Amino acid sequence: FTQLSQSIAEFHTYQLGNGRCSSLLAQRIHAPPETVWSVVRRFDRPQIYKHFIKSCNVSEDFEMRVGCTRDVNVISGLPANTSRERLDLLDDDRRVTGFSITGGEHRLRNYKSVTTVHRFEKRIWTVVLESYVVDVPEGNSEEDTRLFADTVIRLNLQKLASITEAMNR
Amino acid sequence: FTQLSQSIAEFHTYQLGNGRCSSLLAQRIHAPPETVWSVVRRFDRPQIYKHFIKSCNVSEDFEMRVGCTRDVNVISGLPANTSRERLDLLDDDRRVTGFSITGGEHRLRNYKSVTTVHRFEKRIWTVVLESYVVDVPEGNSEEDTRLFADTVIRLNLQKLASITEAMNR
Ligand SMILES: ON(O)c1cc(Br)cc(N(O)O)c1NS(O)(O)c1ccc(Br)cc1
Structure with missing residues (x-):
């Protein structure tokens, strides 16, 4: 589909800079795109669909905007670490986040x-x-x-x- | 079962001195137990059903009974390091491995x-x-x-x- 290839060219293609690496993965889901996106878009609750997250904290006044942050307590290695993450991109009409x-x-x-x-x-x-x-x-x-x-x-x-x-059930 | 409870008592119960922890997990499978066991018993090939195994190697003269070893490279995100795992127990009649x-x-x-x-x-x-x-x-x-x-x-x-x-579905 052309929309797919356009998205890949804009958001999923990368420069091969030294000491860098990149990859692209795809998942078919038997559910409407609105439901999948309603989950994907919630920057404050990545634990809903990610593994190994002990917890995720956002500021008391959190509002989702470019530059907002989250602390993700990760236990996929045992000295637990707190990943500091920043929202780069959110477009509901195009269903793209980063x-x-x-x-x-x-x-x-x-x-x-x-x-x-x-x-x-x-x-x-x-x-x-x-x-x-x-x-x-x-x-x-x-x-x-x-x-x-x-x-x-x-x-x-x-x-x-x-x-x-x-x-979707 | 009586068999289930006895297997738990014998193999899935532990003593609790601090500095140690233990856990039991159960998985229900809609497949015959001989098929599942035929997979689980393969000490030399944990890549079949376990995640995070880059590779797993055994001696060229490998024979699988208690005391044999496998070398597993784990996908941890840390620099590549080979780990040694040892077959503690294997009973095909009782369908137990460890x-x-x-x-x-x-x-x-x-x-x-x-x-x-x-x-x-x-x-x-x-x-x-x-x-x-x-x-x-x-x-x-x-x-x-x-x-x-x-x-x-x-x-x-x-x-x-x-x-x-x-x-065989
Ligand atoms: O799955 N697996 O072996 C594993 C997965 C990730 Br991700 C990272 C690590 N490392 O090496 O940090 C490991 N090795 S392990 O922590 O020694 C380990 C052994 C058993 C169980 Br259960 C859980 C963890």
Whole structure:
């Protein structure tokens, strides 16, 4: 579909800068795009569809805008860490959102990620695209970093499929 | 079952001295217990149903009974490091297997795991029980440790369910 390819060219294509790496993942979901997007868009509640989140805190006066932040307490490695994340992009009409990890996540330094939600018709189904660019830690190989980031995104997208399909019922 | 409770008593109960924690998880599978066991028993190939395994290698003269070892490279996001895991127990008649993590930096300390697979009716279904005991060093959090381990095991058990249910459908 052209809308898909246009989204990939605008939001999921990347420069191959040195010490950087990126990837793009896709998840078909048997649920309407509005439901999937209503979950995907809530920057303050990523635990609804992500794994390994002990908790996520936002300021007492939180309002979702570009530049708003969250603290994500992560327990996917056992000295728990607090990922500091910043909303880069939110467009409800285009169903696109994006965030950055500014600090607190030594495995994903200068992580930047974009998620887009697409409608497909035949029964109205959804395809979610999720991509990222991130530093390769100097001692790391690229494939280690991508393997880690890919594995996590794949599991989270599976959980998102599962929870939105249960919602749609 | 009586068999289920006895297997729990024998293999999934632990003593509670602090600096150690334990947990039991259950997974229900709509597949025959011999199929599930045929998968679970494969000590040399945990990549079949476990997440976060980049690779797993065994000696060229490998033979699988108690005391043999496997080398697993874990997808942790940290620099690549090989871990050594040891087959603690294996009974094909009782459908019980178990292993210990004996080596590996930035891994869990003294992690010990046991998996039993149980027949059930009331078309044949299966319950898989998996438990672990693991260290919690005086600086670490037991809450976080159980969150981490339980999430991993629950994901692995879901993949095992999916894979064994795909077999012969
Ligand atoms: O799944 N798995 O082995 C794993 C997954 C991620 Br992500 C990171 C790590 N490291 O190495 O931090 C590990 N290794 S482990 O923490 O020693 C570990 C052993 C058993 C159980 Br249950 C949970 C964790």
